[PDB]
């Protein structure tokens, strides 16, 4: 389907949280948030939830203790879009019985032609 | 209908919370969260909300007091998907008057043919 039209929203979320991380942490953590690319990359590394993820997390939170509600929100706002989006498709996919009728009318009518 | 296409989402939720439980509790509770299978099984046992459920819960929370917001979230995020999904079907099932007309158009047309 148009499931790549979905990833546009996820890149928008990456973008907005990367701009946030740039506005918040560029002066203090330049290698991780000094550019938009660095913020994108650091958010991806945190989203991996791996060793490097906690490694990035710890100094940012030592310097700015509130920073956690940044990261957590990025993990929540993202995951709850997908799920919600992913739960809407199922509803918009359970409207295809009418589509089976569509094909069947195609059969009968294109014989009449 | 495609009600088994729904259970894919529930297995995705099981998967993500099992990966969470693995990342959080594997080192400290290996028999319950040392593998992905163990995490899946332990989450199912907790979702049962039975004697074994609280039995699993108590040492995990004694060791990590925050762990409750893990379990609770697993119980919430799950149940509020189902309900929400379950409340969307009803809306997408109250659409079928147009379907009844569909069949009635099938009748009048097939004789026409």
């Amino acid at each position, epitope marked *: 389907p148009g499931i790549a039209w979905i990833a546009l929203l996820l890149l928008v979320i990456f973008y907005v949280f990367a701009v946030m991380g740039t506005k918040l942490f560029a002066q203090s953590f330049p*290698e*991780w948030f000094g550019t938009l690319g660095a913020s994108m990359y650091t958010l991806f*590394q945190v989203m*991996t939830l*791996e*060793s*490097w*993820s*906690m*490694g*990035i*997390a*710890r*100094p940012v939170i*030592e310097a700015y203790p509130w920073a956690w509600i940044y990261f957590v929100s990025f993990i929540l706002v993202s995951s709850f879009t997908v799920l919600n989006l992913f739960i809407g498709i199922i509803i918009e996919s359970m409207q295809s019985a009418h589509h089976a009728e569509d094909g069947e009318r195609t059969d009968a009518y294109r014989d009449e032609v | 209908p495609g009600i088994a296409w729904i259970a894919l989402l529930l297995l995705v939720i099981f998967y993500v919370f099992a990966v969470m439980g693995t*990342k*959080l509790f594997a*080192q400290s509770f290996p028999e319950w969260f040392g593998t992905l299978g163990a995490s899946m099984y332990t989450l199912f046992q907790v979702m049962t909300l039975e004697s074994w459920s609280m039995g699993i819960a108590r040492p995990v929370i004694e060791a990590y007091p925050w762990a409750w917001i893990y379990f609770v979230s697993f119980i919430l995020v799950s149940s509020f998907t189902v309900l929400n999904l379950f409340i969307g079907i009803i809306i997408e099932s109250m659409q079928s008057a147009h379907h009844a007309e569909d069949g009635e158009r099938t009748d009048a047309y097939r004789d026409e043919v």
Partner: antibody
Amino acid sequence: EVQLVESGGGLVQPGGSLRLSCAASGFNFSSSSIHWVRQAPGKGLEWVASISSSSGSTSYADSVKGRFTISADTSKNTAYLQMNSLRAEDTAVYYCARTYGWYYSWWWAFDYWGQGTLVTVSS
Amino acid sequence: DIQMTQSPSSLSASVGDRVTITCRASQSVSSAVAWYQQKPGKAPKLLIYSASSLYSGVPSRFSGSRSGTDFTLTISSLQPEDFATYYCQQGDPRLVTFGQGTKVEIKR
């Protein structure tokens, strides 16, 4: 059983190259970070490089930036340190370490250390 | 440029004496510090992480303390197998520095 078996060191001519392998065994390699730390005979420890096995992210020391290159193959279940333009300073015993965490990643422990392998740069 | 100055370089104390090792950072790194034992020619082993927390398996005689910017490794009763070199560490993904080291020699 949770070990880091490293090899690939020895003798190499100046201006040459050498590959160091660190095969992990007994733990989850992807979830960990792998580290190369060197000790020249008669000095303290010196950090060389670090890499996320799963994420692929790398971080190098300013003293060996560009010349060395750290990598990690999760299928081979092993990290690697490729060394180029080797010199007299690089003559040292190199150690492989890890941080396998949720604990030690929020502190950069490093928890476990490989046993060490010597790299002597001579003619 | 996160500097770790470890002192002293060498020390010699009899068995049972109380050994102290200082490691000063240049700024508030509040608890990123770790402490390592290295016996000669062998692999370093983690004694202390979080600058206070003790690694699983370390004897009780090793302890880690903090004063603002100055971290300390203390051995209560020096044992003859505690002959080693001890290193204090920083912590970050993007940079890691160690101390100059402190070689603990036994007296008998």
